[PDB]
Write a protein that binds this ligand. Sequence first.
Ligand SMILES: O=c1cc(N2CCOCC2)cc(N2CCC[C@@H]2Cc2ccccc2)[nH]1
Length: 559
Amino acid sequence: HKLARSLRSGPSDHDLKPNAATRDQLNIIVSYPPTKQLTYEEQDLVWKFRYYLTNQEKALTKFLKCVNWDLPQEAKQALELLGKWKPMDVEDSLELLSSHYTNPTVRRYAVARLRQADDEDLLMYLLQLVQALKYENFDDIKNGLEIDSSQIITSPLPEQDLCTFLISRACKNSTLANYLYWYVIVECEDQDTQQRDPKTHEMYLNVMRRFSQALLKGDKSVRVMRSLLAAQQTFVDRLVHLMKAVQRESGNRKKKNERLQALLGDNEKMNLSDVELIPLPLEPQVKIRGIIPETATLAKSANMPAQLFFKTEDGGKYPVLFKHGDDLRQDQLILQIISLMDKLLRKENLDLKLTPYKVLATSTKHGFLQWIQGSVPVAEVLDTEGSIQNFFRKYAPSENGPNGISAEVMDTYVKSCAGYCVITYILGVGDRHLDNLLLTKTGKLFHIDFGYILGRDPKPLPPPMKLNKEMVEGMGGTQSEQYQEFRKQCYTAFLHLRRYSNLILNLFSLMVDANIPDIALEPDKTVKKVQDKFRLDLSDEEAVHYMQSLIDESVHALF
Ligand SMILES: O=c1cc(N2CCOCC2)cc(N2CCC[C@@H]2Cc2ccccc2)[nH]1
């Protein structure tokens, strides 16, 4: 073993081609998932046929682990092969930016591959790419220059690495700028980072101050970007102050609610019912005129979230749920992954009427959730109308539609049930009950409150497919043509998502050092818990018959 890999071959068999039997062994090893550890035998094998593997872009990520970088004999040839290799897809490049690869060239190369991606894709990975800064050169991030984090943006002055790249893209795209601001603010406000990795806490302040510096340095349109972020930041700082002023001022919930409205209605002091048309950080397409004082209510629940109604640019209400005294990041992640999964299925022309509602932490302590206007907890739906079918008949009846319900509504309910069954199965969402399953009168089922994920549950053995009796009776029972449809969607959705397993797993790779509670328990064992739910051991034909039997053994058990 201890004889180095370039000491055992190279480049006198750059002329190698593997035989039929070996080509199978490689293709298995190459398209392994991206935290599946490789054995010394397999790392040796990948090195042996390294000149063959330069025509399989998939394989590049595997090869670079087998390089020993301390040996400059190895490292100089390895990086020569990195230029002769087929360039990898952006989907894959996220792997190179994780904790596992430390070589400057490898990481700059990854950024060059990212720079091929357009901002719509880049946004879907931005949360993870802010985590990826932790594995960057902290000295180089500092040396770009030319402390409360919430004051940086509001206090002006009278080969790209990852940090330089993200800032460059943010100054050219205001959507990225919005989310890059708030993601980095949370990493600064991360207190566990302040304690155990104070050097990392400094890096994110340096990232924020680097960003603000470019915004001020940039042209006329870019400088306005800075003042819009400053507007958001004080608005949130005022909103958080208004929350503290209620959370403290004692009395019951009804006295606190009267209090909440008093402070909102007072715009001289608190300055929240008539903002100057600023962009909502949650979704910056929505500019907000102010919070409506008279509708604002506090939820009868543990951390007292406030239900707030923003009056918008175009005369509408955009309701949100603002939590003070609660970590949102575990939700931020899940909704962010469900957003992708929704988009990946639509890539394949499968719209399953999913509800990936917006979530933005504006600190570790607090943040925003988009309220879906018209949603009701399935519990509440069962409680007042009796069944999921009675609900739909009352609110969307039809002479010819199935069970006296609009066919379009019944279709929506099926598809959403199917998608969320598969998606809550993969992500390992536990602690499901009828208060965290919501229903809409459009037909849409969806899930909220992701306090338990990646296997975790109050129960020791939860069921793997999160599907109850009431849900099945909403279709028409096990013999309806709806339930036939509901299976077909599940196995198809499961199949399509399997074909982006590599992407999803590379994303979860980046989230291990993010202090998300259900990931922090078993960070190394986190990514396998997702990987294993895809059942990559099976073929597509086998995966279908698996997903089928998953759904059947679950539904059989219910009756
Ligand atoms: O984590 C979430 C997300 C919620 N949303 C966001 C998506 O639209 C529906 C409401 C609501 C909640 N909560 C927490 C306090 C109570 C509320 C749950 C709720 C949902 C629907 C009607 C009444 C109450 N939590």
